[PDB]
Amino acid sequence: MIVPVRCFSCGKVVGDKWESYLNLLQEDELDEGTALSRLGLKRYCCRRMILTHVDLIEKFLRYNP
Amino acid sequence: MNAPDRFELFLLGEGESKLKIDPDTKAPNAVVITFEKEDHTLGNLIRAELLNDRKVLFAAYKVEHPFFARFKLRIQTTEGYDPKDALKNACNSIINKLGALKTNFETEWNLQTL
Amino acid sequence: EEGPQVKIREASKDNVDFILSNVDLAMANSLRRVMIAEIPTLAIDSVEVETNTTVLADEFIAHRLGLIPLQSMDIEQLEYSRDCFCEDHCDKCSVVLTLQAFGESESTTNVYSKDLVIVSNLMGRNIGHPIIQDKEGNGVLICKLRKGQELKLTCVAKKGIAKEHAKWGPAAAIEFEYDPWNKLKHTDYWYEQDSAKEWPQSKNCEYEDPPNEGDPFDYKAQADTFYMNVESVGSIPVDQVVVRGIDTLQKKVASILLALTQM
Amino acid sequence: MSITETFEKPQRTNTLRMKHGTYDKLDDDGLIAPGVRVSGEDVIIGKTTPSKRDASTPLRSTENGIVDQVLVTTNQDGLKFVKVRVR
Amino acid sequence: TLKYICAECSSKLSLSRTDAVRCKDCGHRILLKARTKRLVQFEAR
Ligand SMILES: [Zn+2]
Ligand SMILES: [Zn+2]
Numbered sequence: 001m002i003v004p005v006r007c008f009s010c011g012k013v014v015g016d017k018w019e020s021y022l023n024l025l026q027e028d029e030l031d032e033g034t035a036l037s038r039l040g041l042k043r044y045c046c047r048r049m050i051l052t053h054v055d056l057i058e059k060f061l062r063y064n065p
Numbered sequence: 066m067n068a069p070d071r072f073e074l075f076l077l078g079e080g081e082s083k084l085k086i087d088p089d090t091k092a093p094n095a096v097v098i099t100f101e102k103e104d105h106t107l108g109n110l111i112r113a114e115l116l117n118d119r120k121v122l123f124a125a126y127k128v129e130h131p132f133f134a135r136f137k138l139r140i141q142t143t144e145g146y147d148p149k150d151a152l153k154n155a156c157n158s159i160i161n162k163l164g165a166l167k168t169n170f171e172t173e174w175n176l177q178t179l
Numbered sequence: 180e181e182g183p184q185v186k187i188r189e190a191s192k193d194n195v196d197f198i199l200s201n202v203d204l205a206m207a208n209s210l211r212r213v214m215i216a217e218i219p220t221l222a223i224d225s226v227e228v229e230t231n232t233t234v235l236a237d238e239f240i241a242h243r244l245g246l247i248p249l250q251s252m253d254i255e256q257l258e259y260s261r262d263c264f265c266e267d268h269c270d271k272c273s274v275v276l277t278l279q280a281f282g283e284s285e286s287t288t289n290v291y292s293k294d295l296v297i298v299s300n301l302m303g304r305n306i307g308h309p310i311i312q313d314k315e316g317n318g319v320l321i322c323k324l325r326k327g328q329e330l331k332l333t334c335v336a337k338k339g340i341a342k343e344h345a346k347w348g349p350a351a352a353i354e355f356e357y358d359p360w361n362k363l364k365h366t367d368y369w370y371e372q373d374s375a376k377e378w379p380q381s382k383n384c385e386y387e388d389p390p391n392e393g394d395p396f397d398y399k400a401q402a403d404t405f406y407m408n409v410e411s412v413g414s415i416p417v418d419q420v421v422v423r424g425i426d427t428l429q430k431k432v433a434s435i436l437l438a439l440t441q442m
Numbered sequence: 443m444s445i446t447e448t449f450e451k452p453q454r455t456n457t458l459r460m461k462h463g464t465y466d467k468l469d470d471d472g473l474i475a476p477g478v479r480v481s482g483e484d485v486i487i488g489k490t491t492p493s494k495r496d497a498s499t500p501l502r503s504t505e506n507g508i509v510d511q512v513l514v515t516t517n518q519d520g521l522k523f524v525k526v527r528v529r
Numbered sequence: 530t531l532k533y534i535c536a537e538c539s540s541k542l543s544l545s546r547t548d549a550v551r552c553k554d555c556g557h558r559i560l561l562k563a564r565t566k567r568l569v570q571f572e573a574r
């Protein structure tokens with residue numbers, strides 16, 4: 001639903017890099033690969049955490065009650 | 066439901082001691098210690114150091130089943146040398162080593178910029 | 180100082196790249212493990228929910244809250260509820276926090292760990308402050324609220340360890356290596372044509388001397404010199420993870436000498 | 443004719459027909475309410491049939507969660523409907 | 530207080546027997562049971 005708080009495999013805190021990562025794409029027009037390394041996500045376990053997440057909450061919020 | 070509480074990996078339940086020492090009958094000067102609420106962290110360690118002792122004839126450890134937190138340590142030593150002592154020794158010998166290491170670290174830590 | 184010797188390469192608020200030398204592989208490992216499993220830390224361990232009209236579930240939210248790293252700098256000056264002589268939780272063994280958020284604006288209202296508020300009395304010890312490291316002091320994104328939705332919560336941080344749950348873990352990963360040049364021949368390299376040409380040469384190959392063609396196998400060499408690097412999650416200053424690592428491992432062997440003794 | 447059923451906490455009377463699971467989690471309207479944590483064979487829906495033959499729904503034996511939503515409705519025949527969703 | 534909520538108008542209804550099953554203006558024959566005040570505790574695990 002939402003950015004997991006931490007990387008399943010190692011623990012890295014990642015629940016604080018979703019908005020950044022999102023901006024690093026739109027407003028800076030970077031690519032996910034470069035975007036991720038610039039967020040400090042160097043090892044692929046943490047990378048997949050963000051690169052793969054699906055923000056379904058944004059769709060839930062569209063429901064009235 | 067079947068899963069035991071996680072604290073049971075480091076918390077001695079009732080009636081349990083941290084150690085159970087036993088005399089091995091198969092060989093002389095040998096003992097078998099049952100460490101409760103401990104795993105490979107302390108096993109391979111006390112084992113490894115127990116090996117640097119030359120008057121130690123045998124030292125091995127094993128956790129029979131990954132489910133339960135407890136390992137067995139068998140120590141055999143030359144006559145006159147009590148295994149119990151070798152453990153004590155293997156311990157102190159370890160506790161020191163870690164003290165030294167601790168220091169050297171806090172030392173190099175300061176000399177760093179950031 | 181004769182014995183296990185450190186030799187830091189890099190260092191910062193998150194990583195501590197270093198080189199352990201003059202130590203048995205075992206100790207290098209036990210220390211490696213402890214940093215991962217047994218360093219005490221504060222973490223939300225109980226959530227009371229007064230109101231949640233969010234899009235998530237209580238247990239869902241409650242789960243994240245426990246994953247939110249909390250200030251554990253003076254953790255030793257706090258006790259485990261299980262030992263504390265109080266009934267349940269008191270200021271001697273816990274830290275209470277609050278989270279109240281209301282989707283006021285029409286745009287999507289975000290909820291972060293910065294919005295957590297301590298309500299107990301820290302009695303002077305730095306402890307319980309939600310850790311923050313992002314360029315905008317927001318912290319972890321706990322939830323998202325639409326206009327009209329609400330989230331009234333009450334948590335209770337407590338002292339815990341990784342063995343009990345990964346939320347209490349101070350470490351994030353722990354690079355670990357030795358004999359970057361396979362001289363001890365601890366591993367046998369798989370290959371199609373060339374072992375050497377197919378396997379990348381790791382960082383630490385620069386810090387060591389490549390074996391020489393004709394040199395016979397060094398059958399007496401042991402494994403000393405370990406190239407680690409600890410990464411803190413924030414609940415504790417990096418330098419500390421290592422430090423306290425060596426410590427907890429130290430108190431362990433000690434709790435054992437005291438067993439033989441009182442035995 | 444003059445024989446229905448009612449959703450309300452049953453408490454034994456000239457029939458006593460009930461079951462093990464406790465009803466202490468039901469409200470007097472005969473339905474637990476969201477937020478309440480259930481388990482065992484706890485009674486989720488209390489229904490009676492006439493003086494009082496118990497006709498209530500107990501939670502699935504091997505299950506246990508928290509009530510996520512209770513919905514009360516009506517059919518096309520004007521029947522009182524109840525749907526308890528447990529999370 | 531409130532014993533029930535409404536499928537849509539959110540209005541906190543609450544009526545006795547013979548009151549059928551509707552609401553005020555939003556005759557939605559649905560209605561939700563409203564949460565409890567007996568605060569639920571959670572394990573942060
Ligand atoms: Zn990772
Ligand atoms: Zn207390």
Ligand SMILES: [Zn+2]
Pocket residue numbers: 535536537538539540551552553554555556557
């Ligand atoms: Zn209505």
